[PDB]
Structure formats: structure tokens, C-alpha cells
Design a protein around this nucleic acid. Structure first.
Lengths: 786, 112, 133, 123, 112, 55, 56
RNA sequence: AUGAUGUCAUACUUAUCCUGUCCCUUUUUUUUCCA
């Protein structure tokens, strides 16, 4: 098939790849010049002992570090249980006390240091969250007036195991798929379809012949959860035979039979081994999730399904998506699991409503006041709405005093500080109610036990990308039937629930569209379009889609890539073009990274990329500390723009030694910072392959802004006296309020986002020269237009 | 003590532990919980500083010795008003002395 | 006098420093004793198999650690410690329980940062603090 | 004083003397070596970056070039035997150790640019 | 520093609590307080510049407060320097009390 | 073991008296309710400081 | 810090002005500065030391 | 004898304005000799 043309290309891909890397190391052995009595010798032998000694000091203390850690790492899982004897027992006493002695005989020296810099030193003329416990002993000091059972665990595991909606459905489903290679398996959450199924497969030996069993998930954290769960079931260590591989974190060994991953992870395994010949089975979970990676894997694995009939295709999901599922997949049989723990009474408003956020408020008010025990889940659209919500709720709490009971309002969304995410996971303080205000982040993968009420105002904030304008707008959107059903289904998992729809049966049954548009239509796909072009294709049109994009969307993609220089004038791959597809993240960024090669601003452009990878959550902007926050922000504000702002911010953080309290003092989201650092480090781990020399701009931000241009020339606007307006389409934009240039308002502007919130917007913007534009893109940007 | 036990039994100190002693104490226990504890843990030397304001402002403070945000609020004379009315006679005895009945307002609860 | 006092401060400082230094080293010699007798006191039906497990686990651990540091300079420092600080991670990992907090009907019942005594003003009506009825 | 007021050089040199003394006493603390820091024989090179396919025989071959060998010891992962991709190699002369070193540093054998440094072993 | 400067400026507005007919000079001082309340970093830049380079200041005016039994001097400083000193006041007292400069017998203390 | 007998100091009585004196003196330009607001402020400031030395 | 010590000490030495008389402070302290609380209590610490002695 | 150049404040014009403005949902990309 086109599959075979692909793997043709891809095996030749691996051949040419290995040979290329080998050629390059030969090149470097060429470039690199191997230029390699009595008292001279007896001189430097003391100096070779100098270095032997000192490198040995670090080396010996390093080996001490190794076995040091190893003693306790070893006594973690052997001693505290078993009936063990004299030898290793005595040596546990030994290694216990002995690593104590090491820590102690070093803590002595550090004690000397700090005690002897405690002291008084005449000045010399030369030209963690406890500001509310350091103000709670101010008061108590101002107010002082003095003058076997592991087998038992296994029993419990199996005993719960047996009660799944799949444990009695065990055998016949096994025999069924033994018949059919492609078996669609419809079942809702809690059935265990993600957990019990791969076990069944393994105990049935599909791992024999050394084979593996893949489980893909759309979310890292969900994969980690799943893997922990099934490794506990299987009674082994997570990582050796049951393992998960996600970006930045391998948790597998060559004992791994049961390997969990992401959809992009599996696509990238096709960047390793087109056949998956070590995998006997791929089980794709929750495919309904509608990601670009799901919709690529569908095609690729369907190819493999026709090409590899000894291979096994399992695709499980939550909802009615089996119609199109089977139909695209040659109408595979559909095994139905019935799985739904407890019931929901789903209510509708009497009528349609005008003020649905307030309606949220007054609803939970009534519910809390009247209802029996039980936790509440409420949806909003997102951040600003949601804090306004807790505003209103806690204000009415203030007014209603002891007339009511303790209402643990907790907001939760994606960018809010991670301690504040975790805070909802604590068991509720007896007698009080806990209400979680949430976004559709709480649709999926977050498991909050205790929630017995669920309120849906029936909406969502969906992105919508029109390509005719290049505009993606995160705007309000009445949420689908599948949405409302699943938002409701979030409930019940331990008891009878309720689901209050802020809209009637009429609007529900009548004007409810089934599914969110399968992602590939609505999204922008520059990295992804390019990825499929460089992954076994030329004709990008008759390709085996599930849902193709509009030819419009594809045409825009092609023009994007050509103009940027990834495409020839006929649409195939340049050296610049390939290098970017292999490079992780999109091209515009990729073009900028290549531009660092020309501009000798390698490190700085690297760190910038690392920032734009995650930005959306950098700076925490609380209402209760607005001014000090704006301040720890306004500190770094550099001349040139937000990108070099980010550059210095990261620079200063790592400067502090990757300090968390640093960002805590300086109002920065530690999550964003450290994941960005990781993406830059693995970028550097790509950097050798993409042939980048590690260079500094030596403080010359001109190179920086110019590499930014050489990447993002497309993303530019100019001054018009009727506002800031595009360079090309002359459609009218506005600057984000929180821009480091927001009041600077430059004449020649570069951005990184293009949205239209309440008005058209652009994010991560910088001031440029129109001259660099004739430096870089005289074929795309001509002078007369500037 | 209750704070220790709230750490040991790890409970949350609830309103029932502190509604009894809610304006008692010297700072005042209801200063523990005010809005701006966070930026008032940074105001040190406030007592000397209000003493010395007398050389900077041309007016004379009668509460130089204290601070309402920091020391609490240390007197409550809300019943003075109530007993003043009952001793003068009650609102009816009190408004037989005034022009109230010549306004033809129907009752005195609304007066503003 | 300022020069003289600077000198005497520094001389007294380094005297006392050196005294406590020597005392620290004596402490350390006692701990040298502790270590020697520690291994001495150490040296002299599950343990044999748990012990093949000892060297099995530890030695494949050295395998993975060497090989980490060899594929990437410290891929041990890029894998194992970096495994264990982020929060969603830990919650999925079932690690348990990884200060006083109390009810929120307590907080923010008063807002303001200035004493109500208006800074020495008198002529304003602030006697009682509740509107009459 | 005067263990500080001599230079900056010998100052930090004394502190490196220390760092040694402390790391030694530390490593004996956690208990590896029987006798404290006895000077290592000048006649063994520790040669790392090695190949699991180069053996005692071949390494003793190539390091037979510069001096009379007393042994070639690639320490073995015990219950599987796989070469540890490093080694100790044992000469008769200081001159033999040195002459092997100063030509064999960072050379490519079996397509790997191995490293030679002298033995740090007190083992 | 923004906590220390917020405390400074609150202390300074307490003078003009009533917002009387004040004058030109008090109108101008209130303007300075508000603009440094809006842009708290132009302020702190200005402050630390003053503290670093200035050693010749404007002149201060004097007058007396008559307490009928003796008089009290009252000094009038210029609003720019009033702000730099308010900040330095807060800062020195915070640091001095954290480092424990003043032993416990120095007694207008904040504890009682 | 002992008793403390308290009294208001002489100079504190005199300072209260001078404070009332300047109320009355600067009141030909105040309205009845401001004269009484200043009286109320001064008298609370005395009674709540001394509190049983006044008795 | 010698910078802050110098700012404080040079700020006490200003020209003091009443209706039409002017003079220059050179000896004592202007108590109407805002750090003058700090200066008075530090000086008073030094004089506590002269009264009690360092041992007591 | 009137040049443009201007970071010049002042003066001046249009019965020219005082009513035409504001904060993102979800989440994913494989990696390489250590020394």
C-alpha cells in the first residue's frame, strides 16, 4: 500500500540517517586536529598526581554518593517486611549508621562555616509561604504574659478486579477478538477497558514471542496513572515489565511487555520502526478524544491493519463514535460493554436563561443550603469568569455568616499554580461542603471522588480557526450533546448524582450537535501537515484521512511552508524543510532556530523557543496581590520586546540555580519555567542532529530580533493611523494589554499569537525594523509594500 | 492549645473555637484574621512612629497609644446609645420635645 | 579609633574561629572512631534469596546509572531525581501525604490597613460602630 | 594564622589538601578502604571508555607496546561476566606507565576513542 | 519593597484623612502620593537614586503647636523627600527588628 | 502579695484640660455637632486610656 | 550601609526657616524627619550602655 | 534678505472632542560513543 511506499522510504530513511551521522562524525575527526626529560617528568608526575588526587576527590565522593544512595534505595523494598537474617541484617545497621556518619561528618564542617560567618563584621567603606505564620507569632508574642498481608493485598486486588463490567465479559470478548483482528470495543469509563484488557492479553500470552502490548492515551498524566494502576495489579515494579514512555520520562525496561504512551509517542515510534514488529497488539484508548495525533494514527494503523494481519488493532472509546469508527475501519465488529456505576437524575431548567453565570451562583447557593451531605462540581468557561464566580460565592458566604455552613470554594484550571491545583485533592473537612468550580479541564482525566452534584451551564470556549483570515478565536460555544452527556457522566462514580442543565430538554434534544468537529478540521496544522508530508507522502490530497481538512486549510498550509522555505516551488522537501520536520515543534519557530545559525545567537534563540513552547501560564497575576505582582513582573521589562524579556527571566531563574522560591518571590509559574527548561534541554539534545553550533550573541540583541524576524516575518503588522493593522491582509488588530510594548506601541510590529478575543489580539509581540524584512524575505515581502 | 491540637489531630480550626473569644485578648484575637495581615507583618516600629508624628502634623492625636489594625479595637460602646434612649425616656418621650409631629410623617422608624 | 577597633574585631574573630575549628576536628576524630567500630559491629531464611536480589537490583542499578551517564552526561540527573518533583505526577503516583489551616468563615471579616482613628482627626462621628437599628 | 596569609594560591591549596583529607576520612567513614589513603602504585593505568569486545589478551597486546606488563584486568560484572568497558592495566616501570600514557591518551581502538588516565585505585 | 512603600504611603495619607481645603502644597503632596501609588517602580527607582547620590537637601520650615502649657515644634519637609524618608523609616525599622538591634528594655515597643 | 493603687497623673489631668480649652477656643467657627464630636473624641481618648485611675 | 548613614546624617543638616528668619542646623537633630525615631532610639541605646555597663 | 534641519516652548485653527474604549479552552514530538 501507500503504507509500503512509506516504509520503503522510511527504511531508506533510517539507512541514510545512520550513514549521515557516521559521515558527520568522520567530518569532525577531520576538522579536529589530533596534535597528540628526567626532572621534567618528575615535575609533571606531581602535577598528574595533583589532578589524579582532585578529580579523585570528586570521583571518590561521587562514588560515595552512589553507594550512599544505594544503601537506602536497597533497604526500601527488602528489609521492612521479611524474616531476614544475620548478615544483611547487621549490614543494614551498618549502612544506616554509616550514611548517617557521612552526613554528620560533613554537617560538622558546614556548621563551622555558618557559625563563623554568624559574627559581627564592621561595615567597610568602599566607593516559603509563611507570611501568615510570621504574623501569628507576632500576636502570640505580643500577647504573652510571663513573670501474609501482601497476600491480603493481592486478594483485595483480585476481589475488586472480579467486579468490573468486563470481568464477567472476560472470555467471550477474548474469543471474539481472537476471531477479528480489528474489534471496536465500545465501553464507558470505570469499566477498566484501559486496565483489565491488557492484563487479559498478557496472561493470554500475546507477549510471547517477546511481543509487546501498546496502550496509548492522549494525556501524559493519565498514562502515568494507568501505568501505576496496572503495575500494582500485576504485582511488579512500575518500569520493568509494565512501563510508560512519555516525553522527557522513560519508565520502561527491556523487560517491558506492557508499554503505555501518547498518540504523538506512537506516531514517533513510527519514526523508529515502521512495522512495530515487536508489538503484537496496539490498544488505542478513548480515540474519541479528537486530536491531530489520533486522526493521523487512525490512518497509519489502518494501513498497518491491512498490511499486518497477525498484528492486532484494538480501538476503545467512550461514546457513540463507533459508527464512523467501524465504517472508516471497514466496519469492524463492535463489542459492547455495559458500564455505568451509579445513576444521575438529570434536570433541565424550566426555561432558557439570560444571565447564566449568576444562575450558576444562585443554583449552588440553593443546592448547598438545602441538600443533604455531598460535594458539588460546577462548570464555567474559564479563568476570569471562574474567579468572578468564587468572588460572588464567597461574598455571599461573608454576608450569610453562621447562617450557613463551610463552603470550600476551590477554583481549578490549567494555568493556576500547582499547589492550588492539588488543594482540591484533600479529603473534605468533616461537616463542610466542597464545591469545585472548574473548566472542561474537569471533563476528563481528573478524578474527584465525592462529587455528588454536577452543574452544566451548557457551554464551552472552543477555538475556531478560520484560515481565510489566519485567525483562531477562542470564543463561546454551546457545548455538544456528547459534551453534556459526558460532563454529566463525570458524576455518579460513587453514588447517586444530579446534573443540572441550565437549559431545557427542548434546546437539549433539538439544537444539540453530536460531536466537537474532529480536530484536524478546526485546528492549524503547520508542524503536523509538514510531519505527514515528511512521513511517507507526496500527494497530500488523496491521503487516507478520517476527516480531511478543507482544501482551503491545506492550501494555506502549503503556502505557509513554501514561503517559509520548507518547500520548493513545486512543494517537496528542502534540506531546510526536512530538518524542521524532524525538529520537535512547528516551523516558524524552526525557521527562527535555523536563523540562530546565521546570526550566532544560538543560546538566546534556544531559550526563546523554550519560552514560546509553554508561555500561556508564565506569570501568576492574583487579584489579592495585583500591585506587588505587576511589580515583580515590571522588573524584568527589557527594551526590545517580550521575547528577550522571557530570555532574561529564564536567565535569572537558572542564574538563581533553578530556584523555586525564586519564581515564588518573582511571580512566575514554576511549572512553565521548568517544563520550558526541559524543552530547551531536549532541544539541545536535538541540536547536534540539526547541526547547530553552540553560540552566544555576546549581548547583541540585534541578532536576536533579526533571527526572530527570519522566523516570524509572516507574523507582522504596521502602524496605520486607523490603528495597528496587518502587514499583508491589512486586517485590524490590537495589542494585548499586558505587552511589554503595550504602551510603547511600535511602528513595525511582530507578534506570535493571532486570536481575536473580545477584540482582535496578538501575543508575545516585539518591535522590528522593516529593513530586516528586505534583508530576509524580499521574495515574500517586497519593498513597495513597506 | 487549640492550635496545637488542630495540628496534632490535624483538624481545621472552625468558627466554633473562636466565636466565644472573638473580641477578647490584647492584641485582639480577631486581628489574626483580618484582610491585610500579609502587608502588616511588615509594619514595625509603628508605636514609636505614632508617638513622633506630633512633630510633623499640626494636630494632636488622642489615641497616640494604639492602632486599630494592629492592636485590635479595644472598646465597644454600642449599648451606651440604647441605654441613653431608655433613660431619656424612649423614642416617644424623646420626640415629644421636637417638631416631629408637625412633619406629619406617619411613623418615626423611617426618619433619615 | 575606627582603624584600631577594626583590627581588634578581626583579631578576636580569628582567634575564636581557630579555637572552634580545632574543637570541630576533635569531634570528627570521635566520629572516625564511630565509623571503624561501626563496620566492626556490623560484620559480625529469606535473606539468601533477597540477597541475590540485593546484588541483582543494585548491580542492574549501576548498569542503568552508568548507562544513563554514558548516553547523556548525567541522564541519571535527567531521569531519577527529576522524576520526583511535580504535582499531577505525584497524585497519579499514589505517593501519600507528599501547618495550621482553618475555616474561611473566619477570614476577611474586616478590611483596611489604617487605624480608624483618622490620624488625629476628631470632628468626625466614629463613636459607635453599628448603624442604630 | 599563616595557614591563610601566604598567598591565594597556597591558601586554596591548603583547602584542597583539606578537601582531600575530608573526602578520604569520609570514604573510610562510609567504610571502603581498610588502611587510610596509602599511596597508589605508579604502575597501573586506568583505561576507560572501553569496548565489551576488547579483552585482557588484546588490551595486554596493545599495552605490551610500551612496557613489560604485569597484568590486564577488566573488572567483570560478576554473575554475567560482561566487560565493564573500563580496565586496569599493570606495568613494571614508572617509565612503562608513562610511555603508555603519553601515546595512548584518547586514541581510537575498536572504533572507540578510549580514555587512559593513571590508576586512582587504592584497591 | 512594594509592601514597605505601600505602608509608607498609607502613613502619609493619614495626614490628609479629612481632605479639607488643604492648600497648594498639600494638593501637590497628595498628587505625588497618588502617582507613586500608581507606578510603584518609578518611585522605588527615584528613592534608591536619592539614597545613593543626594547629600544637599532643600530647606524645612518650622512652626509651633501651642498646647497652652508649652509649645511643640512642628517641622515641614518637602514632599519628595518626605516620601524617600517615609520609605527609609519603614525599611530601617523592619530590618532592625529582624536583626534584633534594640534590646527589650527600649520601650515604646509594639507588643503592648 | 501586694496591691497597686492607681491614679491619673497631674500632668495628664492638665493636658486633658488644655485640650478641652482649645476645643472651646477654636469653636466660633464650628457647628454644634462638631463641637460635640471633638468633645466625644477627647473624652473617649481619656477614659479608654486610664479606665480605673479615673475612678 | 555607609550610604544610608550618610544620607541620614546629611539630612539632619538643613536650613530651618520661619517667617523671615533662616538658620542652619549643625548641632542637634531635626525631630520632624521620619527616621528620627530610629536615630533617637539608637542613641538612647548607647546611653543605656553608659548607664548599665556592658556586663549588666 | 527669509535654507532645511530639528525633539523648542509659546501662540494659533477647525460653532473641530468630554463619549467612538478592556484579560486564553484543552494537550501531545523519538536520541545515541559518556570518562
Amino acid at each position: 500500500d501507500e503504507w509500503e511506499r512509506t516504509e520503503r522510504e522510511r527504511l531508506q530513511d533510517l539507512e541514510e540517517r545512520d550513514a549521515f551521522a557516521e559521515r558527520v562524525r568522520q567530518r569532525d575527526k577531520d576538522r579536529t586536529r589530533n596534535v597528540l626529560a628526567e626532572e621534567d617528568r618528575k615535575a609533571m608526575v606531581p602535577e598528574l598526581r595533583k589532578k589524579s588526587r582532585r578529580e579523585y576527590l570528586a570521583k571518590r565522593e561521587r562514588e560515595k554518593l552512589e553507594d550512599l544512595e544505594a544503601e537506602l534505595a536497597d533497604e526500601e523494598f527488602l528489609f521492612g517486611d521479611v524474616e531476614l537474617s544475620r548478615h544483611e541484617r547487621q549490614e543494614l545497621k551498618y549502612k544506616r549508621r554509616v550514611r548517617d556518619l557521612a552526613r554528620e561528618y560533613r554537617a560538622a564542617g558546614e556548621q563551622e562555616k555558618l557559625e563563623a560567618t554568624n559574627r559581627y563584621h564592621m561595615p567597610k567603606e568602599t566607593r516559603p509561604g509563611e507570611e501568615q505564620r510570621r504574623w501569628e507569632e507576632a500576636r502570640l508574642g505580643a500577647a504573652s504574659l510571663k513573670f501474609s498481608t501482601q497476600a491480603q493485598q493481592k486478594e483485595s486486588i483480585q476481589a475488586v478486579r472480579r467486579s468490573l463490567p468486563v470481568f464477567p465479559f472476560r472470555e467471550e470478548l477474548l474469543a471474539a477478538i481472537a476471531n477479528h483482528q480489528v474489534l471496536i470495543i465500545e465501553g464507558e469509563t470505570g469499566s477498566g477497558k484501559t486496565t483489565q484488557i491488557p492484563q487479559y492479553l498478557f496472561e493470554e500470552g500475546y507477549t510471547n514471542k517477546g511481543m509487546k502490548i501498546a496502550c496509548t492515551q492522549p494525556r501524559r498524566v493519565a498514562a502515568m496513572s494507568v501505568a501505576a494502576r496496572v503495575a500494582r495489579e500485576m504485582g511488579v515494579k512500575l518500569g520493568n515489565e509494565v512501563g510508560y514512555s512519555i516525553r522527557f520520562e522513560d519508565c520502561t525496561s527491556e523487560r517491558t511487555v506492557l508499554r503505555y504512551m501518547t498518540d504523538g509517542m506512537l506516531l514517533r515510534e513510527f519514526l523508529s520502526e515502521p512495522d512495530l514488529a515487536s508489538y503484537s497488539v496496539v490498544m488505542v484508548d478513548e480515540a474519541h478524544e479528537r486530536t491531530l495525533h489520533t486522526d493521523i494514527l487512525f490512518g497509519l494503523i489502518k494501513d498497518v491493519a491491512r498490511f499486518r494481519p497477525e498484528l492486532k488493532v484494538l480501538v476503545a472509546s467512550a461514546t457513540m463514535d463507533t459508527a464512523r469508527f467501524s465504517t472508516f475501519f471497514d466496519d469492524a465488529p463492535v463489542f459492547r460493554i455495559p458500564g455505568r456505576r451509579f445513576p444521575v437524575d438529570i434536570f433541565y431548567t424550566k426555561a432558557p436563561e439570560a444571565d447564566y453565570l449568576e444562575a450558576c451562583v444562585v443554583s449552588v447557593l440553593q443546592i448547598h443550603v438545602t441538600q443533604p451531605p455531598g460535594d458539588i462540581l460546577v462548570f464555567l468557561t474559564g479563568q476570569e469568569e471562574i474567579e468572578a464566580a468564587c468572588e460572588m460565592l464567597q461574598d455571599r458566604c461573608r454576608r450569610l455568616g453562621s447562617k450557613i455552613r463551610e463552603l470550600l470554594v476551590l477554583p481549578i484550571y490549567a494555568n493556576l499554580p500547582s499547589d492550588m491545583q492539588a488543594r482540591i485533592f484533600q479529603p473534605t473537612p468533616p461537616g463542610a461542603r466542597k464545591v469545585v468550580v472548574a473548566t472542561n479541564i474537569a471533563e476528563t482525566s481528573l478524578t474527584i471522588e465525592g462529587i455528588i452534584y454536577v452543574l452544566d451551564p451548557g457551554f464551552c470556549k472552543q477555538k475556531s480557526y478560520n484560515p481565510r483570515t489566519g485567525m483562531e478565536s477562542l470564543t463561546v460555544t454551546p457545548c455538544s450533546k456528547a459534551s453534556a452527556n459526558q460532563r454529566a457522566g463525570r458524576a455518579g462514580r460513587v453514588a447517586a448524582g444530579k446534573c443540572f442543565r441550565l437549559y431545557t430538554a427542548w434546546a437539549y434534544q433539538h439544537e444539540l450537535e453530536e460531536t466537537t468537529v474532529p480536530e484536524i478540521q478546526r485546528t492549524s496544522l503547520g508542524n503536523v501537515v509538514l510531519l505527514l508530508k515528511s512521513l511517507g507522502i507526496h500527494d497530500l490530497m488523496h491521503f487516507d484521512f478520517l476527516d480531511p481538512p478543507p482544501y482551503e486549510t491545506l492550501l494555506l498550509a502549503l503556502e505557509q511552508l513554501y514561503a517559509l522555505g520548507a518547500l520548493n516551488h513545486l512543494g517537496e522537501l528542502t534540506t531546510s524543510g526536512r530538518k524542521m520536520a524532524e525538529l520537535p515543534v512547528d516551523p516558524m519557530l524552526s525557521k527562527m532556530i535555523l536563523a540562530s545559525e546565521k546570526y550566532s545567537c544560538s543560546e538566546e534563540i534556544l531559550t526563546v523557543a523554550a519560552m514560546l513552547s509553554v508561555n500561556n501560564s508564565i506569570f501568576y497575576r492574583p487579584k489579592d496581590k495585583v500591585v506587588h505582582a505587576d511589580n515583580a513582573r515590571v522588573n524584568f521589562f527589557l527594551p526590545g520586546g517580550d521575547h528577550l524579556v522571557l530570555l532574561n527571566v529564564y536567565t535569572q531563574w537558572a542564574e538563581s540555580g533553578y530556584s523555586s522560591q525564586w519564581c515564588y518571590e518573582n511571580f512566575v509559574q514554576f511549572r512553565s519555567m521548568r517544563r520550558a527548561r526541559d524543552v530547551r534541554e531536549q532541544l539541545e539534545g536535538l541540536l547536534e542532529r540539526v547541526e547547530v553550533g553552540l553560540s552566544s550573541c555576546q549581548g547583541d540583541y540585534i541578532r536576536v530580533r533579526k533571527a526572530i524576524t527570519a522566523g516570524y516575518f509572516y507574523h507582522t503588522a504596521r502602524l496605520t493611523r486607523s490603528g495597528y493593522r496587518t502587514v499583508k491582509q491589512q486586517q485590524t488588530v490590537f495589542i494585548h494589554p499586558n505587552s511589554s510594548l503595550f504602551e510603547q506601541q511600535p511602528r513595525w510590529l511582530l507578534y506570535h499569537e493571532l486570536v481575536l478575543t473580545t477584540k482582535e489580539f496578538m501575543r508575545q509581540v516585539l518591535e522590528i525594523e522593516s529593513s530586516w524584512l528586505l534583508e530576509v524575505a524580499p521574495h515574500y515581502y517586497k519593498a513597495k509594500e513597506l | 492549645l487549640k492550635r496545637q491540637e488542630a495540628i496534632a489531630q490535624n483538624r481545621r480550626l472552625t468558627l466554633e473555637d473562636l466565636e466565644d473569644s472573638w473580641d477578647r485578648g490584647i492584641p485582639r484575637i480577631n486581628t489574626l484574621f483580618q484582610k491585610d495581615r500579609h502587608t502588616l507583618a511588615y509594619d514595625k516600629g509603628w508605636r514609636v512612629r505614632t508617638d513622633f508624628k506630633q512633630y510633623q502634623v499640626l494636630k494632636q492625636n488622642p489615641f497616640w497609644w494604639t492602632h486599630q489594625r494592629h492592636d485590635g479595637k479595644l472598646w465597644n460602646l454600642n449599648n451606651y446609645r440604647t441605654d441613653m434612649i431608655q433613660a431619656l425616656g424612649g423614642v416617644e418621650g424623646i420626640l415629644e420635645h421636637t417638631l416631629f409631629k408637625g412633619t406629619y410623617f406617619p411613623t418615626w422608624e423611617g426618619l433619615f | 579609633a575606627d582603624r584600631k577597633a577594626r583590627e581588634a574585631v578581626e583579631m578576636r574573630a580569628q582567634v575564636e574561629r581557630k579555637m572552634a575549628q580545632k574543637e570541630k576536628e576533635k569531634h570528627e576524630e570521635k566520629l572516625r572512631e564511630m565509623a571503624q567500630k561501626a563496620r566492626e559491629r556490623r560484620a559480625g531464611d529469606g535473606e539468601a534469596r533477597e540477597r541475590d536480589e540485593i546484588r541483582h537490583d543494585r548491580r542492574k542499578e549501576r548498569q542503568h546509572d552508568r548507562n544513563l551517564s554514558r548516553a547523556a552526561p548525567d541522564k541519571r540527573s535527567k531521569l531519577q531525581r527529576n522524576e520526583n518533583r511535580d504535582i499531577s505526577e505525584v497524585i497519579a503516583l499514589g505517593v501519600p501525604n507528599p501547618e495550621v489551616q482553618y475555616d474561611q468563615r473566619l477570614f476577611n471579616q474586616s478590611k483596611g490597613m489604617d487605624s480608624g482613628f483618622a490620624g488625629g482627626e476628631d470632628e468626625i462621628y466614629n463613636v459607635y460602630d453599628q448603624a442604630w437599628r | 594564622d599563616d595557614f591563610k596569609g601566604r598567598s591565594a594560591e597556597e591558601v586554596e591549596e591548603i583547602k584542597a589538601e583539606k578537601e582531600a583529607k575530608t573526602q578520604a576520612i569520609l570514604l573510610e567513614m562510609v567504610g571502603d578502604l581498610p588502611d587510610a589513603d596509602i599511596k597508589p602504585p605508579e604502575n597501573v593505568l586506568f583505561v576507560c571508555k572501553l569496548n565489551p569486545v576488547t579483552t585482557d589478551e588484546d588490551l595486554e597486546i596493545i599495552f605490551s607496546r610500551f612496557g613489560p606488563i604485569r597484568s590486564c584486568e577488566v573488572i567483570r560484572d560478576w554473575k554475567t561476566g560482561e566487560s565493564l568497558c573500563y580496565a586496569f592495566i599493570e606495568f613494571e616501570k614508572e617509565e612503562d606507565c608513562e610511555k603508555a600514557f603519553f601515546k595512548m591518551d584518547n586514541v581510537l581502538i575498536d572504533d572507540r576513542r578510549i580514555h587512559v588516565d593513571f590508576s586512582q585505585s587504592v584497591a | 519593597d512594594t509592601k514597605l512603600l505601600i505602608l509608607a504611603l498609607e502613613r502619609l495619607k493619614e495626614a490628609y484623612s479629612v481632605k479639607s481645603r488643604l492648600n497648594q502644597s498639600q494638593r501637590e503632596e497628595l498628587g505625588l502620593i497618588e502617582q507613586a501609588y500608581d507606578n510603584p517602580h518609578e518611585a522605588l527607582s527615584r528613592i534608591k537614586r536619592h539614597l545613593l547620590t543626594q547629600r544637599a537637601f532643600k530647606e524645612v520650615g518650622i512652626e509651633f503647636m501651642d498646647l497652652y502649657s508649652h509649645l511643640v515644634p512642628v517641622y515641614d519637609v518637602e514632599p519628595l523627600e518626605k516620601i524617600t524618608d517615609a520609605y527609609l523609616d519603614q525599611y530601617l525599622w523592619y530590618e532592625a527588628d529582624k536583626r534584633r538591634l534594640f534590646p527589650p528594655w527600649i520601650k515604646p515597643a509594639d507588643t503592648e | 502579695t501586694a496591691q497597686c493603687f492607681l491614679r491619673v497623673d497631674d500632668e495628664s489631668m492638665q493636658r486633658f484640660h488644655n485640650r478641652v480649652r482649645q476645643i472651646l477656643m477654636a469653636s466660633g467657627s464650628t457647628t454644634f455637632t462638631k463641637i460635640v464630636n471633638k468633645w466625644n473624641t477627647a473624652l473617649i481618648g481619656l477614659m479608654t486610656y486610664f479606665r480605673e485611675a479615673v475612678v | 550601609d555607609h550610604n544610608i548613614a550618610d544620607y541620614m546624617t546629611a539630612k539632619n543638616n538643613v536650613v530651618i526657616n520661619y517667617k523671615d528668619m533662616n538658620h542652619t542646623n549643625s548641632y542637634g537633630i531635626i525631630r520632624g524627619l521620619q527616621f528620627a525615631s530610629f536615630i533617637v532610639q539608637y542613641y538612647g541605646l548607647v546611653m543605656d550602655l553608659l548607664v548599665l555597663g556592658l556586663h549588666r
